Amino acid sequence: GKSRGYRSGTRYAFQRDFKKHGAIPLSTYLKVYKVGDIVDIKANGSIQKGMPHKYYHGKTGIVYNVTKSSVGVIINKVVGNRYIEKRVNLRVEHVKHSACRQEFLNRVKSNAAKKREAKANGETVYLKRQAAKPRGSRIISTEGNIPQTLAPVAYETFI
Amino acid sequence: QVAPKWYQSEDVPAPKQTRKTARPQKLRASLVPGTVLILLAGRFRGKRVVYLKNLED
Amino acid sequence: QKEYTEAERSVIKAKRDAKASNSYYVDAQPKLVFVVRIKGINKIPPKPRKVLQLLRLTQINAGVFVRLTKATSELIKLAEPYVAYGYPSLSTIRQLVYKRGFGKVNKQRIALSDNAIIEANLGKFNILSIEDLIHEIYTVGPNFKQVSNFLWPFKLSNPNGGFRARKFQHFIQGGDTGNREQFINALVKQMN
Amino acid sequence: MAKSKNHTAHNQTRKAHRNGIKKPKTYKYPSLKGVDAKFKRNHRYALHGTAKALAKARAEKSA
Amino acid sequence: GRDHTSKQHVRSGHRTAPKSDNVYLQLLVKLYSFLARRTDAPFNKVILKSLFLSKINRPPVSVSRISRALKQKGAAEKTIVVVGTVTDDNRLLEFPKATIAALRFTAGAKDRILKNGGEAITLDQLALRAPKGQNTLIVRGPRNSREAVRHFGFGPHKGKAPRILSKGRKFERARGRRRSRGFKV
Amino acid sequence: VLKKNPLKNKQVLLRLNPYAKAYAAEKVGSAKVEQAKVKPSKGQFAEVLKN
Amino acid sequence: SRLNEYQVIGRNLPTESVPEPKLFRMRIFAPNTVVAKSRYWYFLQKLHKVKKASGEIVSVNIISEAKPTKVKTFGIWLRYESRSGIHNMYKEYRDVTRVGAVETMYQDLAARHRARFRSIHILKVVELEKTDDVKRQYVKQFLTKDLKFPLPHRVQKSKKLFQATAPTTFY
RNA sequence: GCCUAGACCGAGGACUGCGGUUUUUACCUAGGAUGUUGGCAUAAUGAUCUUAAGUCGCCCGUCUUGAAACACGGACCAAGGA
RNA sequence: UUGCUUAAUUGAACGUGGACAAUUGAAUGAAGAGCUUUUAGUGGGCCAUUUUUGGUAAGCAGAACUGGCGAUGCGGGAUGA
RNA sequence: AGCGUGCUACUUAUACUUCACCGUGAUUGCUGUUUUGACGCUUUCACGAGUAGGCAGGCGUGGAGGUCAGUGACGAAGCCUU
């Protein structure tokens, strides 16, 4: 019949990477997690304690609690027509800092740095990001790059 | 049956001031005094006649 | 008007000079596009349907101006099988705004019959006349977003002369949907 | 005799999107349920002394 | 054919007139309809809406709540505005001298307000001495202290009150309310 | 109460666009362009013919 | 269709590694410039590692006929897809313009092989200058000296529905 | 920019506005039709009923994924009837 | 501030005070957002594209996503959910 | 008047554009001119499919309170009727 156990369907997700089995490098145990930090959840198969459920493998959340060897992570899950607040206890082996903030945090510093320079210079500076615009006009020099005429080639069997 | 009410007034409102100032009629270029015309309607339909004057009517 | 004439003559002179000096002038990619929804409201998948709702195209023969970027290009790409879009000329924009131009005033569709209507809603953006609005649309300006969202989506009529034999195929393949890049003007003249 | 439709998810996303899907409301102070008692025990004393310090500073400014 | 982004012909969902057929309430609505239309005072629009509220949405404002409001910093001489009934509170030790405009006063509340040197006026008199709501302070009664609100949102792990007729050891206390009888929710 | 097309009604056009009158006076829509008579494609651009 | 011959020139987008990419030209027979640029990319991606996103269109120009009022014989090399496989044919056409021989070819492959415009690639359109360069007999018969032929059985189209006189087919 | 042919409509009802011409505290094509002419008022016109012609139209109610069904109830009428 | 933590005057959490104003930090849109109570019917479904399982196959049986019919008239497919 | 392909014109949906009218929702304004309807009038814009079902506004029947100092043997009620 049907089987719907805890680790059903986790044959490949919970596998260690190729040529990456064995013990955990200790930079994992040295990272410092604070409440409010944003962490990516990726279950490590070699540690079976504090292992997340298969739904949370690949999810990103908010650290809300710090314990002896684990952190509490907040995940929003769609259940029907609304989101339900979930609180998962995860050992730090299954938790990594999300890199989305460190990119945005630098932009906060850069925007502050650029705004004081313009204020010091008394001008106005625009800090909104802009999508890729259509390219402008340009002149193509043919000196050394005279166009070569291409044509579709005849059909041919190569086997 | 519902009886009429006091607020149901009876006066006829004045018409709004229209902007229909008339302009002179334009005739066809082929209509020139002396031209022989053919009548298409009326008692004298089918008759050939002589055009003399453009009346202001 | 003077700067329109100067820009046109400058582009022509640049092309001629490039032709003279053994070069090739590559024209600047258009910044503005006009998008007309040519497909009805029935049997639309949810993602293109949401895209069309975000473009304010909720009926057939509805037109809208879009400033081309990566985000807007990827938006229009999803709605391509249901819209015909292209690069509008100055005269096409002027005819559209003059004949079928309506503003969104307090969530109401108000005809742009006087400059007071345009000023009362766009004076904080330095738009004082219908020509200011047309200039802001044609040359994509700093206040393009506010001016374009002020305009109610244009409600065009069916083309005089019809479409091609079959609409709902790409313009390259003999249909009407997709990008036609200068023929949007002929379509609008048929349609406006 | 009654072999019927066992299960389908058809039409379920339509019903999920009539009134949803609603993201949860975010507040400035999330609830401290599930937080370690040892932290939560000390946090009670830290807040208590903190308000006392602010009260005495404000009390001097009035008299 | 229109692709509707919203439900069509949806009513505002708010009261635009009192459900009551009281002729004298319609006179107060008449007065504050003119005021909310001709004054641009935000006080006038708020009073007009509160005149439309139902009975459960106009809880009584006790004379202690007004006393607490009169004890705010600089609000001692303000005109307390209560769109509803003002009830007595025999738990007070004293009530200050103040003017209170209310839809209704109970016999005990009016007796105490006048005895302390205050004034108990109706809302029409408020418009004569404060057509723009100058120096006023609107006070509202507690809405969620109602007994019906106790049972709203009842469910497992909610902490609300079950809808029940009798209270005792034999009425909904054994299984699901106690781990000695299975589980507790 | 009635929308009027400025592309048909001249008074409405002059109301919305005061410059239109000037556009008529100088005949800007039929403006002659003064320029030299040159053939700038006589050189490598004749590469259009064959390559 | 009603076609035109276009010069389309494109190149890969300039890169810091490659700041002057090679310019590529093709001759495209398309009804308009929108199909012209579309067909141009369709052939570069069959021959080069480039895309419309990673490339750039540099020039689109109409190549007008050099002698639109001179009778010429064009030999066309094709590559079309049938219901079974892919075949190469060479066919010849008589016309005054280069586009007109291509237009005839598209009508001819539709009529004789049920080959649609999407199924046909034009490898080369060549003017046959010499009479010896002509290989197909269905066009050599019009290269004979002092060619004369009547048009027997002329059919006259009538404006009226009924004709009071007996018909004739002389010409 | 100019000339030119046809069709459909006339909502509103003192004034107010935006413009233009300004020969002008005036006029206009500029916030929605007026002028004039004939005929009739035993009638031209409009409506309904019956009928003819053209075109479309399967027998309602019901359970049902699906009814005109070769699925079930219904000959008709009056009163009662949930 | 703490009774947590540190060898510590270290940190953790929460704060006092001060600086950075509409480009307050991507696009587009928004008949506005949020909240609550209460109650109806329903809980036989079916079809089309595409992915797919059993089956020789089936107008067969079973699933995935979307769109429809049911609950829907109108123009086309002569006729047809 | 078949098949493949191209073009020009033409035909018409309860679809699109403009206009009229009906209703719904929102919206503008209205008391020294509120002026015997403010549960009213007024401006503007948008929208209009629908079984099960919900709600709102109305029509009709037997009796009851009040009022029309209501109709009526000089003809009530009922019934038939292009």
From Swiss-Prot, chain A:
<dbReference type="InterPro" id="IPR008991">
    <property type="entry name" value="Translation_prot_SH3-like_sf"/>
</dbReference>
<dbReference type="InterPro" id="IPR036948">
    <property type="entry name" value="Ribosomal_eL21_sf"/>
</dbReference>
<dbReference type="Pfam" id="PF01157">
    <property type="entry name" value="Ribosomal_L21e"/>
</dbReference>
<dbReference type="GO" id="GO:0022625">
    <property type="term" value="C:cytosolic large ribosomal subunit"/>
</dbReference>
<protein>
    <recommendedName>
        <fullName>Large ribosomal subunit protein eL21</fullName>
    </recommendedName>
</protein>
<comment type="function">
    <text>Component of the ribosome, a large ribonucleoprotein complex responsible for the synthesis of proteins in the cell. The small ribosomal subunit (SSU) binds messenger RNAs (mRNAs) and translates the encoded message by selecting cognate aminoacyl-transfer RNA (tRNA) molecules. The large subunit (LSU) contains the ribosomal catalytic site termed the peptidyl transferase center (PTC), which catalyzes the formation of peptide bonds, thereby polymerizing the amino acids delivered by tRNAs into a polypeptide chain.</text>
</comment>
<dbReference type="InterPro" id="IPR018259">
    <property type="entry name" value="Ribosomal_eL21_CS"/>
</dbReference>
<keyword id="KW-0687">Ribonucleoprotein</keyword>
<keyword id="KW-0963">Cytoplasm</keyword>
<dbReference type="InterPro" id="IPR001147">
    <property type="entry name" value="Ribosomal_eL21"/>
</dbReference>
<dbReference type="GO" id="GO:0006412">
    <property type="term" value="P:translation"/>
</dbReference>
<comment type="similarity">
    <text>Belongs to the eukaryotic ribosomal protein eL21 family.</text>
</comment>
UniProtKB/Swiss-Prot annotation, chain B:
<feature type="region of interest" description="Disordered">
    <location>
        <begin position="1"/>
        <end position="25"/>
    </location>
</feature>
<comment type="subunit">
    <text>Component of the large ribosomal subunit. Mature ribosomes consist of a small (40S) and a large (60S) subunit. The 40S subunit contains about 32 different proteins and 1 molecule of RNA (18S). The 60S subunit contains 45 different proteins and 3 molecules of RNA (25S, 5.8S and 5S).</text>
</comment>
<protein>
    <recommendedName>
        <fullName>Large ribosomal subunit protein eL6</fullName>
    </recommendedName>
</protein>
<comment type="similarity">
    <text>Belongs to the eukaryotic ribosomal protein eL6 family.</text>
</comment>
<comment type="function">
    <text>Component of the ribosome, a large ribonucleoprotein complex responsible for the synthesis of proteins in the cell. The small ribosomal subunit (SSU) binds messenger RNAs (mRNAs) and translates the encoded message by selecting cognate aminoacyl-transfer RNA (tRNA) molecules. The large subunit (LSU) contains the ribosomal catalytic site termed the peptidyl transferase center (PTC), which catalyzes the formation of peptide bonds, thereby polymerizing the amino acids delivered by tRNAs into a polypeptide chain.</text>
</comment>
Swiss-Prot record, chain C:
<keyword id="KW-0963">Cytoplasm</keyword>
<keyword id="KW-0689">Ribosomal protein</keyword>
<comment type="subunit">
    <text>Component of the large ribosomal subunit. Mature ribosomes consist of a small (40S) and a large (60S) subunit. The 40S subunit contains about 32 different proteins and 1 molecule of RNA (18S). The 60S subunit contains 45 different proteins and 3 molecules of RNA (25S, 5.8S and 5S).</text>
</comment>
<dbReference type="GO" id="GO:0000463">
    <property type="term" value="P:maturation of LSU-rRNA from tricistronic rRNA transcript (SSU-rRNA, 5.8S rRNA, LSU-rRNA)"/>
</dbReference>
<dbReference type="GO" id="GO:0003723">
    <property type="term" value="F:RNA binding"/>
</dbReference>
<comment type="function">
    <text>Component of the ribosome, a large ribonucleoprotein complex responsible for the synthesis of proteins in the cell. The small ribosomal subunit (SSU) binds messenger RNAs (mRNAs) and translates the encoded message by selecting cognate aminoacyl-transfer RNA (tRNA) molecules. The large subunit (LSU) contains the ribosomal catalytic site termed the peptidyl transferase center (PTC), which catalyzes the formation of peptide bonds, thereby polymerizing the amino acids delivered by tRNAs into a polypeptide chain.</text>
</comment>
<dbReference type="GO" id="GO:0022625">
    <property type="term" value="C:cytosolic large ribosomal subunit"/>
</dbReference>
<keyword id="KW-0687">Ribonucleoprotein</keyword>
<comment type="similarity">
    <text>Belongs to the universal ribosomal protein uL30 family.</text>
</comment>
<dbReference type="GO" id="GO:0003735">
    <property type="term" value="F:structural constituent of ribosome"/>
</dbReference>
<protein>
    <recommendedName>
        <fullName>Large ribosomal subunit protein uL30</fullName>
    </recommendedName>
</protein>
<dbReference type="GO" id="GO:0009986">
    <property type="term" value="C:cell surface"/>
</dbReference>
Curated annotation (Swiss-Prot), chain D:
<dbReference type="Pfam" id="PF01779">
    <property type="entry name" value="Ribosomal_L29e"/>
</dbReference>
<dbReference type="InterPro" id="IPR002673">
    <property type="entry name" value="Ribosomal_eL29"/>
</dbReference>
<feature type="compositionally biased region" description="Basic residues">
    <location>
        <begin position="1"/>
        <end position="26"/>
    </location>
</feature>
<dbReference type="GO" id="GO:0003735">
    <property type="term" value="F:structural constituent of ribosome"/>
</dbReference>
<dbReference type="GO" id="GO:0022625">
    <property type="term" value="C:cytosolic large ribosomal subunit"/>
</dbReference>
<feature type="region of interest" description="Disordered">
    <location>
        <begin position="1"/>
        <end position="35"/>
    </location>
</feature>
<comment type="function">
    <text>Component of the ribosome, a large ribonucleoprotein complex responsible for the synthesis of proteins in the cell. The small ribosomal subunit (SSU) binds messenger RNAs (mRNAs) and translates the encoded message by selecting cognate aminoacyl-transfer RNA (tRNA) molecules. The large subunit (LSU) contains the ribosomal catalytic site termed the peptidyl transferase center (PTC), which catalyzes the formation of peptide bonds, thereby polymerizing the amino acids delivered by tRNAs into a polypeptide chain.</text>
</comment>
<comment type="subunit">
    <text>Component of the large ribosomal subunit. Mature ribosomes consist of a small (40S) and a large (60S) subunit. The 40S subunit contains about 32 different proteins and 1 molecule of RNA (18S). The 60S subunit contains 45 different proteins and 3 molecules of RNA (25S, 5.8S and 5S).</text>
</comment>
<dbReference type="GO" id="GO:0002181">
    <property type="term" value="P:cytoplasmic translation"/>
</dbReference>
<keyword id="KW-0687">Ribonucleoprotein</keyword>
<keyword id="KW-0963">Cytoplasm</keyword>
<protein>
    <recommendedName>
        <fullName>Large ribosomal subunit protein eL29</fullName>
    </recommendedName>
</protein>
